[PDB]
């Protein structure tokens, strides 16, 4: 059984190929949509269902932390809520009122801001 290529829909006869996204590909049919590099071996990210390499992602495909306003590395974990996301860091995801870290705590969101408790939301008007 030769593995089938999910891009060009034909079999791979080379003895080298790439596995990504649960699928097989000719080396040259899994490539950064932005800079065209061969993704094989390398870290990549699915943005709008096209694979991009790590530096293209960092350079034009965002995810900017609501707390510190810096990009969140696509390799590390992050906290999301609705359209928002924060580094999983005591500096980014904490209480707007009292600074209490909220990673894995109960919290209360109000647009961007985020609080540990009703009390804390009730200060901050």
């Amino acid at each position: 059984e030769k593995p089938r290529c999910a891009g060009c829909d034909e079999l791979i006869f080379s003895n080298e190929y790439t596995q990504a996204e649960n699928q097989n590909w000719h080396l040259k049919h899994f490539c950064c949509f932005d800079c065209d590099s061969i993704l094989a071996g390398e870290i990549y990210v699915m943005v709008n269902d096209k694979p991009v390499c790590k530096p293209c992602y960092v350079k034009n495909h965002a995810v900017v932390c609501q707390g510190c306003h810096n990009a969140i590395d696509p390799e590390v974990q992050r906290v999301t809520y609705n359209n928002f996301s924060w580094h999983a860091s005591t500096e980014c995801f904490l209480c707007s009122c009292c600074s209490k870290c909220l990673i894995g705590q109960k919290f209360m969101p109000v647009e961007g801001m985020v609080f540990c408790s009703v009390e804390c939301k009730k200060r901050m008007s």
Binding site: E16, Y17, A20, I43, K54, Y57, Q77, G104, F107, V118
Partner: peptide, 22 residues
Amino acid sequence: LQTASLRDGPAKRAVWVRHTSS
């Protein structure tokens, strides 16, 4: 009130399937 859930980064690795030489 709700709970903070760590989600994983969207990055993955493209596995380079290739045999080892003699």
